[PDB]
């Protein structure tokens, strides 16, 4: 039974009322409002459920709401009126998405939000019901009021923002009681001048956490309490914790201008003497056993932490007053040190240490760590196991593409159905000043798809600026101009050899295996793909698989893919026999990858191969310099630098191995030489 603790009754009521008392001083960040909506009282006041909160999380995350409740709040903080990335901007965006589809365009330089379209956007009408109230008290609690006007303010705030419930009734009653007690103590002196809001807020925050509980001090369970002065009760076993230096005795510095500290009298009371008398009463009140434990070694740096002066004087008097019968007459200081070492029991740092379970003076009673200390357990076996797998008749092309995009991931999330689902990213605190990552890639992809049809780049610029995804003013124009320059440089190479082609069907029978699928945009020149990415081996493997599935049924022609920085993947047309042979090889690799995890790294294995391959002689080099440069390229592509995420930093590769052993590295090298060799053999 734990007594003398701080009385904590309802945190999400008192803390929410304190946050509501800081409403004009708050910046109205989106996270602080979703934290206020996390309280079930404030959510049940505005008829918001948990599913509505879960929808509103992603709605605020995608609608571009970062900070600022209103434009007048932005103008209040001496900031320029941007007009976007505010709560009013997101509300107008969600209402325009409820009214108008996103394909129509902007209306008042505000792009609509196509997600909230049905009746669920009614919950938006609840959220707009909240922030407007969060406006009104923001204009209410700013002006300073005398103490005769602060009486109904907390009551109106409680009946406006909160709803009465069975559990939270006592918290609101305590809030009203403390507020009326503060106002009664203020009006007892008849205060006439004005009183600001922050003083009453700090006074209520100090008075709300002052309560203590001591009801279960002697109920019958073992007592857990702090040292309270003028309370000495005899007990059989008295234990003391936290007797190190600095913590005890608790030092309270005087005010400095107090006259009682200058000229002390007999009846003066100080906290240091009270703590020393408490230690004396704890020494006297112990009848049978006295236990004392203090932190002696630091958990961070293993530094020696000295105990308090009272315990040091106690052990000094023990060592100077008693001696062991083993060394009857040896010395005075040596027998004292031997007694102080015999009393001091230096316990182990970890609970699973076998020193504690050794039989002798002290022995642990934790039987749960006994097999951990016995070292009699089986080790972790390997995750790789040979599984039975029968190759079906009809294997689609999409399954082979998902396999050869990532073979370990296709072994994890499709064979054993284990998909490591990571949590979504939180909402950022500020507007995007720069463009990097997925948003920049989506902007470049849409700009390349717009310039491939010779469309108006300015209309897409206004469309992306109306959604707030671009930086405000001139910087967004500069970013759009440089991205338009890069995409025009790419489109001048893309549409130089583009012909209109339609999607065709693929129905193949290879080694008794049926392959059914569809190939999009099949031109009479061959295959034409364009992506605004870098030169990578995964896109080359995808283009090689599409070229194999295209050349196997007719289709004499090249296959071309155009990347950025003059990167190009080209494959010449091949015969039907070589295409069917390589397709049977890929099917055999797929059926090997479904039984056992096929360790074929695309990027690092392709880098090792292109370091070891020679396209002039169609043979692999075996000199030591190429064998060292291929290892260097493999270690560069597996674990990248501090600016580029490497291939080894992945949740699918860390499950198999924790450290890249050279045996598994040679296995990956052999699998990449077996499979990724026609990638660089037919590259031109």
């Amino acid at each position: 039974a734990i007594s003398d603790r701080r009385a904590r009754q309802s945190h999400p009521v008192l803390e929410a009322f304190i946050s509501l008392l800081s409403l004009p001083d708050s910046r109205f960040v989106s996270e602080d409002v979703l934290a206020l909506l996390d309280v079930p009282v404030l959510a049940a006041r505005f008829d918001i459920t948990e599913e509505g909160l879960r929808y509103l999380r992603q709605w605020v995350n995608e609608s571009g709401i970062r900070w600022g409740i209103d434009d007048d709040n932005v103008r209040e903080l001496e900031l320029p009126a941007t007009g976007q990335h505010t709560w009013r901007f997101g509300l107008t965006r969600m209402l325009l998405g409820y009214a108008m589809e996103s394909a129509q365009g902007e209306w008042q330089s505000v792009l609509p939000y196509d997600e909230s379209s049905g009746l669920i956007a009614e919950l938006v009408g609840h959220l707009a019901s909240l922030l407007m109230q969060l406006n009104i008290w923001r204009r209410g609690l700013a002006q300073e009021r005398p103490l005769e006007e602060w009486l109904p303010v907390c009551r109106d705030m409680l009946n406006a923002f909160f709803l009465p419930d069975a559990e939270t009734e006592a918290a609101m009653t305590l809030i009203e009681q403390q507020w009326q007690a503060i106002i009664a103590e203020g009006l007892g002196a008849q205060y006439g001048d004005a009183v600001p809001l922050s003083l009453l807020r700090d006074e209520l925050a100090q008075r709300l956490d002052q309560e203590r509980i001591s009801q279960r001090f002697l109920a019958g369970p073992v007592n857990i309490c702090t040292l309270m002065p003028m309370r000495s009760i005899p007990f059989k076993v008295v234990c003391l914790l936290g007797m190190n230096d600095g913590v005890y005795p608790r030092q309270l510095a005087p005010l400095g201008f107090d006259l009682m500290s200058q000229k002390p009298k007999r009846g003066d009371r100080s906290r240091r003497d009270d703590d020393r008398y408490l230690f004396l009463e704890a020494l006297i009140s112990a009848q049978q056993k006295l236990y004392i434990s203090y932190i002696g070694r630091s958990i961070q740096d293993n530094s020696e932490r000295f105990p308090s002066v009272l315990v040091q004087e106690l052990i000094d008097y023990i060592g100077q007053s008693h001696y062991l019968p083993g060394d009857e007459a040896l010395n005075c200081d040596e027998s004292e040190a031997r007694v102080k070492a015999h009393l001091t029991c230096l316990h182990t740092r970890m609970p699973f240490d076998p020193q504690n379970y050794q039989p002798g003076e002290r022995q642990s009673y934790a039987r749960e760590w006994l097999p951990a200390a016995s070292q009699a357990g089986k080790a972790h076996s390997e995750f790789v196991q040979p599984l039975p797998f029968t190759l079906p008749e009809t294997v689609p092309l999409e399954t082979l593409q998902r396999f050869w995009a990532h073979p370990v991931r296709a072994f994890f999330q499709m064979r054993l159905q284990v998909n490591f689902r990571t949590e979504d990213s939180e909402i950022p605190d500020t507007e995007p000043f720069i463009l990097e990552g997925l948003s920049r890639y989506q902007i470049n992809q849409q700009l390349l798809n717009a310039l491939v049809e010779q469309d108006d780049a300015e209309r897409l610029f206004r469309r992306f600026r109306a959604a707030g995804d671009l930086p405000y003013g001139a910087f967004g124009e500069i970013f759009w101009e440089t991205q338009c320059q890069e995409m025009q440089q790419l489109a001048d190479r893309v549409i130089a050899c583009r012909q209109p082609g339609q999607s065709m069907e693929i129905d193949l029978a290879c080694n008794g295996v049926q392959i059914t699928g569809w190939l999009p945009q099949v031109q009479p020149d061959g295959l034409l793909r364009w992506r605004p990415s870098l030169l990578s081996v995964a896109q080359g493997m995808q283009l090689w698989l599409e070229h194999l599935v295209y050349c196997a049924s007719g289709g004499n022609g090249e296959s071309r893919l155009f990347l950025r920085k003059d990167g190009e993947w080209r494959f010449p047309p091949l015969a039907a026999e070589q295409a069917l042979h390589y397709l049977s090889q890929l099917i055999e690799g797929y059926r090997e990858g479904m039984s056992a995890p096929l360790l074929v790294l695309p990027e690092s294995g392709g880098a090792w191969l292109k370091t070891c391959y020679d396209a002039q002689n169609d043979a692999m080099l075996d000199d030591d310099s190429t064998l060292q440069k291929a290892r260097t390229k493999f270690l560069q592509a597996y674990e990248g630098n501090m600016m580029v995420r490497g291939e080894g930093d992945d949740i699918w590769y860390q499950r198999l191995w924790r450290q890249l052993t050279p045996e598994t590295m040679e296995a990956i090298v052999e699998q990449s030489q077996r499979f990724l060799l026609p990638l660089f053999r037919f590259n031109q």
Partner: protein, 262 residues
């Protein structure tokens, strides 16, 4: 080397806990009063703080409603209801609350009652049912063996014409709005909420208190009975409605004292 762990032979402790009775278990009218724990404690504090000799002042009721936080329109009906409570006598002879002086009354007597035997529910409920007539129904409650101390807070103890009496306050009374709170409905409420054990422990505590305090004490001579006062059931025209007077058989108390002693 080989190492082993010690095992505890027995239980670490018996069931020792200091518990209470709760651990062992027109437009303005008092019927239209909001029924809850906080209004019940507010009416209990109003009946505790108010003096019984002096007449009730309406401005004091308005200030107390300002301190509590209730509506101001209820105040002029509440004070006349309070005087209607104070005008109603609660005794077998017709003794009102205004005849009690300050030295005769004692509000919120806190008592601690010891028990050194393991409290068996089967040996206690049968001893209750042997003498108490209200235990015909009421299938017995189940609780663990409680050895130690028992806390209790009696609302009011008062003497009159050389006879001691107990008074408690119950004010929830949600299910009644009409004049149906007769003796049968009050007995059904006592059997449902199981206030018989609380009243029996109150009689045992008062018997031990009058034995420890007053020398040459007799249980039949000094004790008169226990009165339960339902606040929302007191009417001006019905003196019997609202009050509930009970006297023990004077044989259960000695056996309960022998059981709690050892």
């Amino acid at each position: 080397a080989e190492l082993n762990a010690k095992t505890l032979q027995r239980l670490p402790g018996d069931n020792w806990r200091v518990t209470s009775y709760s651990g062992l278990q027109p437009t303005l009218t008092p019927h239209q009063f909001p029924r809850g724990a906080s209004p019940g404690t507010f009416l209990h504090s109003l009946f505790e703080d108010l003096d019984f000799t002096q007449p009730v002042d309406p401005n004091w009721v308005r200030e107390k409603l300002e301190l509590g936080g209730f509506e101001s329109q209820w105040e002029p009906v509440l004070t006349e209801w309070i005087t209607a409570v104070l005008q109603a006598p609660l005794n077998e002879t017709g003794v009102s609350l205004s005849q009690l002086s300050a030295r005769n009354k004692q509000v919120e007597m806190e008592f601690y009652l010891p028990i050194s035997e393991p409290l068996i529910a089967s040996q206690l409920d049968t001893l209750i049912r042997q003498f108490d007539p209200l235990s015909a129904g009421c299938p017995p409650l189940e609780f663990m063996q409680v050895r130690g101390m028992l806390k209790g807070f009696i609302d009011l103890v008062f003497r009159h014409e050389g006879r001691y009496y107990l008074l408690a306050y119950k004010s929830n009374w949600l299910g009644e709005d009409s004049s149906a709170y007769t003796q049968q409905a009050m007995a059904a409420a006592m059997q449902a909420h199981r206030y018989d054990l609380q009243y029996q422990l109150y009689t045992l505590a008062l018997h031990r208190y009058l034995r420890h305090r007053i020398a040459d004490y007799d249980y039949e001579h000094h004790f008169g009975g226990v009165i339960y006062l339902f606040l929302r059931g007191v009417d001006k025209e019905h003196p019997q409605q609202g009050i509930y007077t009970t006297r023990p058989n004077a044989g259960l108390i000695a056996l309960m004292d022998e059981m709690f002693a050892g």
